[PDB]
Ligand SMILES: CN[C@@H]1[C@@H](O)[C@@H](O[C@@H]2[C@@H](O)[C@H](O[C@H]3O[C@H](CNCc4c(COP(=O)(O)O)cnc(C)c4O)[C@@H](O)[C@H](O)[C@H]3N)[C@@H](N)C[C@H]2N)OC[C@]1(C)O
């Protein structure tokens with residue numbers, strides 16, 4: 001009631017935050033003792049599992065100053081910077097506490113280095129007001145043009161390339177395919193405009209590297225997969241585009257628990273093994289759930305893969321009913337957005353989650369059988385999870401109509 | 409070569425970061441095993457002491473999932489928000505990961521609510537480019553006017569109050585006193601312009617509250633004293649001025665180790681006990697050092713008090729020799745800036761530090777006996793620590809001369 005902010009978190013049907021007392025692996029316990037399976041995982045930043053013991057031991061030693069203190073440089077920092085450069089590439093690297101701060105700092109630096117006013121953007125880049133706009137496809141008061149992953153609009157803006165400082169995108173892989181990325185990179189290379197890959201969510205999510213070799217980013221940002229939820233974001237790329245980062249310093253720069261969590265987590269994510277385990281387990285859950293709904297006439301499908309997926313519901317009434325039924329079974333989904341299992345989502349948890357889905361499907365069967373997913377269902381669902389337009393065939397006038405329906 | 413940023417940290421005479429491989433309480437250990445006494449304390453954010461055991465145990469349990477998960481609201485968050493409001497006042501409260509992020513967010517929010525373009529500013533508010541300017545006393549490209557704590561310039565701008573959204577200051581108490589704050593508040597009340605008290609450094613520093621009852625802030629920010637170095641900043645104040653905070657959310661909002669550090673630290677800082685202990689211990693060190701230098705003819709005085717103080721050297725050559733002698737004895741000062749002891753600066757550590765100061769004084773004796781502390785010495789020393797002009801009597805023409813000397 002005192003809070004001036006509106007943090008994203010699980011909320012009940014009345015909008016009140018759901019409180020959880022404790023967590024271990026994939027399971028959360030609520031104040032009433034009920035155990036829930038977490039698919040939200042701090043918005044995808046818990047990738048190893050809640051309370052992971054190896055990370056916890058490193059955090060605990062760091063909380064006692066055993067490898068360094070917040071006052072000063074220590075060998076842990078050298079190790080972390082080297083790990084980031086090895087896995088993501090680039091001339092130089094930088095560190096931040098949030099993805100929002102990293103994206104603002106990098107975008108300002110690139111704009112300054114390029115001495116150009118316009119930035120073309122798709123995807124969410126954090127809460128800073130520099131990204132706010134009243135309308136898509138036109139510059140906001142900060143010179144940023146939201147293009148909603150529409151390549152026709154992008155090509156239009158890139159046809160006059162001399163004023164375009166950069167193109168910044170948060171890559172989606174549920175609704176954008178290989179053809180989208182090949183054309184995106186062709187267009188940006190043709191205009192000679194640097195690409196900023198905002199991989200806060202997808203960097204290290206699917207493999208031990210950035211999300212797609214079909215992008216050639218001049219600058220990257222990663223964060224959620226770096227530190228099992230501890231507040232660390234990293235950036236890197238071409239030195240001349242990041243020169244202004246020399247002006248960046250913050251009080252908690254050397255704080256040791258954050259670096260302990262990042263070095264320990266990154267070492268495991270750099271092997272690719274957690275992402276392979278998550279992919280297999282999540283794929284099993286997706287296949288079971290898709291069939292459970294399809295075999296009961298429930299108009300809900302899924303997009304994505306085991307590492308990152310989402311539910312696609314026929315309409316908002318179906319989605320609301322699904323979310324209520326899922327919560328009643330103790331499934332904790334990121335409602336209307338993407339689901340991101342952690343490595344603690346093992347076969348035993350998959351089996352538990354599938355039984356809960358069987359009960360969700362039972363609760364919904366017979367309520368919505370005469371409804372079907374339409375193109376509108378797909379666009380609306382994708383919009384909520386990846387913050388722009390799915391890559392489905394349409395004309396320039398149809399783009400305007402879809403945006404008119406979905407833009408708030 | 410790898411790091412694109414230039415973080416503030418202790419550096420040797422060649423500008424290279426000093427490496428410390430562990431720390432505990434008031435002592436840091438360098439790669440050669442030598443123990444130094446820390447007066448920097450992560451730029452004043454370690455106020456209980458490195459590796460404080462109560463905080464460490466809480467962080468460790470939080471790292472094991474015992475006190476909530478990053479996915480959701482936890483049982484302890486309400487107690488954090490409630491105590492922040494009890495200690496600092498205000499209608500509503502918000503949380504951030506750095507002081508830089510807090511200051512940018514609240515300044516943008518206040519300006520938006522006031523629907524006015526100009527912000528008058530003194531003091532450091534973080535690294536964001538919105539604060540960068542080429543010259544003082546005139547608006548930068550973001551509408552920010554740096555006034556260097558000069559009340560004649562402030563009064564001139566406040567004489568056209570209709571365009572002034574807010575006045576944001578980082579309060580200093582080494583070089584600004586009752587006279588300055590009484591007049592600052594008189595001017596801002598007369599203009600009916602809200603004050604943003606950037607208490608990132610001084611909030612909770614001197615007592616269980618904000619830094620001076622002579623300020624009446626509409627918005628406050630605290631951070632360094634809140635979480636023993638973990639990355640937590642807090643804001644609060646008038647609900648309508650912070651309306652835009654409803655759009656603030658970030659992935660790590662509920663991260664449990666930060667929450668454990670802030671709640672455990674705030675519960676202790678809210679009693680006033682650490683601040684009283686630091687004040688007494690630091691006052692003993694100041695008194696000993698002032699007398700040692702005065703008896704040896706060493707032209708170095710001190711300003712401030714046990715919670716936050718600085719050295720005032722006659723000139724840069726004296727300062728350079730002082731800092732080299734101090735490093736040789738294992739005193740780790742924040743060079744040219746403020747010293748901020750932690751609660752680990754106990755009587756035993758005071759005695760050790762006084763012995764090291766005895767050796768510093770002996771090493772400086774006879775080298776600078778013919779040097780006086782001028783007005784130039786005081787203004788230059790204060791400028792480095794509190795980022796503007798000390799409140800010492802001066803003419804308007806003298807203000808121009810000082811600013812011309814010290815602005816870069
Ligand atoms: C007009 N714009 C509309 C807005 O309402 C706004 O909606 C956002 C919504 O996008 C957001 O969800 C997205 O982001 C979360 C969290 N991701 C963070 C992130 C950052 C910032 O990092 P930080 O949190 O500061 O550490 C930077 N870059 C990327 C790629 C990030 O993912 C993701 O978890 C969700 O998957 C993603 N949809 C909501 N959390 C808050 C809403 N206000 O923008 C989109 C919308 C509809 O268009």
Ligand SMILES: CN[C@@H]1[C@@H](O)[C@@H](O[C@@H]2[C@@H](O)[C@H](O[C@H]3O[C@H](CNCc4c(COP(=O)(O)O)cnc(C)c4O)[C@@H](O)[C@H](O)[C@H]3N)[C@@H](N)C[C@H]2N)OC[C@]1(C)O
Nearest residue numbers: 250251416451506507508532533534578608609745793795
């Ligand atoms: C050449 N011009 C100069 C600028 O470069 C710039 O100088 C700063 C200097 O002020 C800074 O020291 C000050 O700040 C440190 C750290 N305190 C942070 C702080 C914040 C931001 O919090 P965050 O770090 O993001 O968590 C917000 N508000 C306050 C009140 C803060 O203290 C303090 O520890 C020092 O005591 C203080 N002097 C240097 N660390 C870096 C320099 N670049 O601004 C001043 C000057 C003239 O303009």
